[PDB]
Amino acid sequence: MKLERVTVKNFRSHSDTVVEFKEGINLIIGQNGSGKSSLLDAILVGLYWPLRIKDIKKDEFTKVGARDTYIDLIFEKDGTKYRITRRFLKGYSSGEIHAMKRLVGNEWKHVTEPSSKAISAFMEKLIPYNIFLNAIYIRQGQIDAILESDEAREKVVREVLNLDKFETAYKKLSELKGGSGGTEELIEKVKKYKALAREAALSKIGELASEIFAEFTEGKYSEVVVRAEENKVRLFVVWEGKERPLTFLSGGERIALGLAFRLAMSLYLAGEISLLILDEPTPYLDEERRRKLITIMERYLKKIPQVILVSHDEELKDAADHVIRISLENGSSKVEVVS
Amino acid sequence: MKLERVTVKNFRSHSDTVVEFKEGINLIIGQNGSGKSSLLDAILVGLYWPLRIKDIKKDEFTKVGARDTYIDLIFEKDGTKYRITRRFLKGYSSGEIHAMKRLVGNEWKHVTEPSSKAISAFMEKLIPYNIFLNAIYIRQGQIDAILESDEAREKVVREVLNTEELIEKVKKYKALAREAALSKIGELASEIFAEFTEGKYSEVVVRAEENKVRLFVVWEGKERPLTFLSGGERIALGLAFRLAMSLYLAGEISLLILDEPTPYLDEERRRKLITIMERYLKKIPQVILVSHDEELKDAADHVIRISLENGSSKVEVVS
Ligand SMILES: Nc1ncnc2c1ncn2[C@@H]1O[C@H](COP(=O)(O)OP(=O)(O)NP(=O)(O)O)[C@@H](O)[C@H]1O
Ligand SMILES: Nc1ncnc2c1ncn2[C@@H]1O[C@H](COP(=O)(O)OP(=O)(O)NP(=O)(O)O)[C@@H](O)[C@H]1O
Ligand SMILES: [Mg+2]
Ligand SMILES: [Mg+2]
């Protein structure tokens, strides 16, 4: 998956903004209240409306003084370039218009009926909503969300592992029944092989998270243990040779672990999904940890085909591949392409 | 309320720590993983055990390698000096000792039966737990908690604030006292938030409605909902409202403990925080501030440094 162009009119601080995204680390740099998250949430609205997210509401997100909100997103997936267009009318949801098209040669052509329902169904088939919200787009303040519960984590992990190319093949063979030694034996074989493949994926996620978290904490925590048990995915950190629960960590260490785990999932998915969007990675991190973040950008974020990073921290500029500066001018966001 | 001395043995990273708190801004500076929040949570445990907070578990907070945890707190309230002492023994219960005493004449005297239940009951009457957690000690990550719920805000405020036709006039004075209290908090919050945001938001509106306390920010002359704010702005508003509440109660409570005020703040807002420490935090008789941000040392009255050496917190008194 690759975002190419985002056009936004009258969404929060954005009156008329166009952003071209590219390969590599795209950094959006801006002060508090400049329009960074507004841009990222417009992308989320563009892709997945209707949302049932409490802090995102149409009546609220229309720019003050305007009546009409417009979002136009162009992205690539599996070789096909897609375009989704949405228009919202403030306080009057009957002028609301939605469209999703694909690029056929030189022409944009409808890929489904121009309706929220049809577009939603199509998008869900392209990239499941739960995968996007919990493994691709990490909203401001949600870095440690995947640490807080054996509910959201188990679900996203299971759904992430479900993206494996052989998953549907496994499930099918599991359905046949001849009551024969051949059928039973084969289904048992498939079930075992699938379980081992998952365990390997989870081990690989644990390996990556361990390497990143050890780098982050200068070896203070020697491993991040990721263990599937029944309907749970357990997470531990190893300190002085033994597994400890996540409450062992400090507030800053928790952010560091969240980043480690997010990155590890994105790296495991670098081929299948290939996109990470991260909004303000520095909260609670001390000076040393922010420095390590730059190192981890160089060594890990560079290994994900497309990354969109948003921050107020100027020191991250040097580690990005493309820099866009956003600022608030006359009550409207202004976007400047630096790199 | 004033904190005087906290003594901690084998609590998280603390093998053996003593900290003396004083009047004014007490800043504890330390890196990630050094022992700052551990110290503050030990104070919470010391005062209000048993707690039913998910991330604070007796079986977990005993320092690794050790068996016995000890917390000893000295504090003043309403002119009386109190000492609470707790000893925990991991895995077991009946071996534990809890005591609370007051300075009568020369020596410490039990205020109640030396038991968790009796002490809990006494502490609740002296300083209700809900007031301590919601208005006095703001835990790491909780700065904006008070921004979340009209009804939750209502409860905190409610607790922190408190012939045949004579019943009609009773409700009148009550709603008037309430509205005046809210107006003052609003005024204080507005002043602080406006300074914090360089006048981007001209006012913070704190409005009484039945069962609720509504919160709005004024932008370009109109009230907007809290969702209008950016992430960093929300932190600044949380700080403004917390400070406003502490300032309103400076004569009754007089203590504020804040853990890591700088998350999500940009460089400009972090510099502004220092100005706000100088102008407002210093109006609160005792403040305990802990942070990894060295820049904050500027406006502190007393500075303590904490660092982790060979697996244990070490406290250094700088000033
Ligand atoms: N409906 C609206 N109309 C006009 N402006 C709005 C509207 N809603 C929100 N805003 C403003 O949009 C600004 C930017 O919000 P946001 O994009 O979340 O900030 P940010 O760049 O992500 N900064 P931060 O997270 O604090 O570092 C806010 O400061 C609001 O003042
Ligand atoms: N039972 C324990 N025994 C020994 N060490 C522990 C124990 N529990 C937690 N720790 C350690 O205590 C350290 C300090 O935690 P904490 O006091 O929360 O950090 P902090 O100083 O507040 N830093 P931060 O919030 O990240 O800026 C942690 O980093 C853990 O390694
Ligand atoms: Mg933001
Ligand atoms: Mg802390």
What is the Cα–Cα distance from A47 to A62, expressed in whole angstroms? Answer: 17
Residue closest to A299 by CA, chosen among A210, A211, A222: A211
CA distances to A19, A51, A70, A326 from A9, rounded to whole Å, are 12, 19, 5, 15
What is the Cα–Cα distance from B235 to B238, expressed in whole angstroms? Answer: 5
What are the E-state strand segments in chain B? Answer: 2-11, 14-20, 24-30, 68-77, 80-89, 97-104, 107-110, 137-138, 203-209, 212-219, 222-224, 255-259, 286-291, 302-309, 312-317
Chain B residues inside the 8 Å CB shell of A316: none
Closest Cα to atom 24 of ligand 2: B32
What is the Cα–Cα distance from A222 to A241, expressed in whole angstroms? Answer: 8
Which residues make beta-bridge pairs with B303? B27
Q: Give helix then strand counts, H and E, for chain A.
A: 9, 15
What is the Cα–Cα distance from A154 to A230, expressed in whole angstroms? Answer: 10
Nearest-Cα residue of chain B relative to residue A288? B31
Farthest CA pair distance, chain B = 73
How far the first Cα of chain A sits from its last, in Å, is 22
Which ranges of chain A would DSSP assign to H, the alpha helix? 36-48, 58-61, 116-126, 129-131, 152-161, 167-173, 181-216, 251-268, 287-299
Burial of A322 per CB tally in 10 Å (0-12, 13-18, 19+): middle
Q: What are phi and psi of A304, to 5 degrees?
A: -105, 120
- Token representation of residue A259: 């980043």
How many beta-carbon pairs below 8 A join chains A and B?
A: 86
Ligand 2 site residues, Cβ closer than 6 angstroms: A 248, 250-253, 286; B 12-13, 30, 32-38, 61-64, 140, 260, 292
Q: How far is B194 from chain A (nearest CA, A)?
A: 14
Q: Is residue A249 annotated as involved in ligand binding?
A: yes
Q: Is residue A32 annotated as involved in ligand binding?
A: yes
CA–centroid distance, A36 to ligand 3, in Å, is 5
What is the Cα–Cα distance from A290 to A277, expressed in whole angstroms? Answer: 18
User: Quick check: B37 and B140 in contact, CB under 8 A?
Assistant: yes
What is the Cα–Cα distance from B272 to B279, expressed in whole angstroms? Answer: 11
Q: For residue A288, give the nearest of B31, B267, B311 by CB distance.
A: B31
Task: Give me the CATH topology for the region B1-319.
Answer: Rossmann fold (3.40.50)
Whether A140 is in the pocket of ligand 1, judged by its Cβ within 6 Å, is yes
Residue closest to A42 by CA, chosen among A15, A24, A22: A15
What is the Cα–Cα distance from B80 to B162, expressed in whole angstroms? Answer: 22
User: Is residue B8 classed as helix, strand or coil in its secondary structure?
Assistant: strand
User: Quick check: B315 and B304 in contact, CB under 8 A?
Assistant: yes
Nearest-Cα residue of chain A relative to residue B293? A286
Q: Is residue A34 annotated as involved in ligand binding?
A: yes
Which ranges of B49-166 would DSSP assign to H, the alpha helix? 58-61, 116-126, 129-131, 150-161
Nearest-Cα residue of chain A relative to residue B201? A33
Q: How was this structure determined?
A: X-ray
Q: What are phi and psi of A16, to 5 degrees?
A: -155, 100
Determine the distance from the C-alpha atom of residue A183 to the mean position of all C-alpha atoms in its chain, rounded to a whole number: 40
Domain boundaries, chain A: 1-339
Which residues make beta-bridge pairs with A239? A242
What is the Cα–Cα distance from A198 to A211, expressed in whole angstroms? Answer: 20
Which residues make beta-bridge pairs with A229? A232
**CATH, domain A1-339, list 3.30.70.870, 3.40.50.300, 3.40.710.10, 3.90.1300.10:** 3.40.50.300
Q: Which DSSP state fits A64? A: T
Note whether A147 contacts B: Cβ–Cβ < 8 A. Answer: no
User: Quick check: A2 and A75 in contact, CB under 8 A?
Assistant: yes
**B302: number of Cβ within 10 Å:** 18
Note whether A150 contacts B: Cβ–Cβ < 8 A. Answer: no
Find residues 195-224 of chain B whose CB sits inside 8 Å of chain A.
197, 200, 219-220, 222, 224
- Token representation of residue B195: 């300074």
Virtual CA dihedral for A148, A212, A32, B306, nearest 10 degrees? 80
Contact A33 B225 (CB under 8 A): no
Contact B236 A34 (CB under 8 A): no
How far the first Cα of chain B sits from its last, in Å, is 22
Q: Is residue B233 annotated as involved in ligand binding?
A: yes
Can you spell out the DSSP letters for B145-161? GGGS-HHHHHHHHHHHH
For residue B8, the ligand closest to its alpha carbon is: 2
**What angle (nearest 5°) sits at the alpha carbon of residue A257, between those of residues A251 and A258?**
90
- Length of chain A counted residue by residue: 339
Chain A residues inside the 8 Å CB shell of B224: 64
Note whether B64 contacts A: Cβ–Cβ < 8 A. Answer: yes
Note whether B142 contacts A: Cβ–Cβ < 8 A. Answer: no
Query: How would you classify the pairing of strands A80-89 and A97-104?
Result: antiparallel
